[PDB]
Specification:
- Chains A, B: Belongs to the Bcl-2 family.
- The structure is a homodimer.
- By secondary structure, the first copy, chain A, is mainly α.
- Chain A contains four helices and no strands.
- Chain A is extended.
Chain lengths: 81, 81
């Protein structure tokens, strides 16, 4: 926890670290995403992925955004057998 | 959004689509990273990447920002033609 040698580099890292934590701490996304129908979690997710690939949209650094989203849905269902 | 039937599912997907695209529009963030001293930009990145692996910690949703930033920073500097 307590450590500081490159206060200028640590400062940039601090701002980015908060964005990552806030991304996961975004209660609005947690509830909206938590509302994904429980009788077909794979179908609702297949629609998001299918529409993204169907329109030919593939921006950079967005595929990884899908990895956390896909990671959260599979783990959420894996922790609630 | 040409063609639709489950506007509730498409709207949820739209939120995820807007988070990735809207972030790409955050010019302020781009300016902060663009301030990395020209003296070998990989040096300031090595400081953050080294610390992330140095303590053995890996918070969920941090790697996404590291791949999005590391991948976006290397291609940006590699696109010098």
């Amino acid at each position: 926890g307590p450590g500081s040698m490159d206060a200028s580099t640590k400062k940039l890292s601090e701002s980015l670290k908060r964005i990552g934590d806030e991304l996961d701490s975004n209660m609005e996304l947690q509830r909206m995403i938590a509302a994904v129908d429980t009788d077909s979690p794979r179908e609702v997710f297949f629609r998001v992925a299918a529409d993204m690939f169907s329109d030919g949209n593939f921006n950079w650094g967005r595929v990884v955004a899908l990895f956390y989203f896909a990671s959260k849905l599979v783990l959420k269902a894996l922790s609630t057998k």
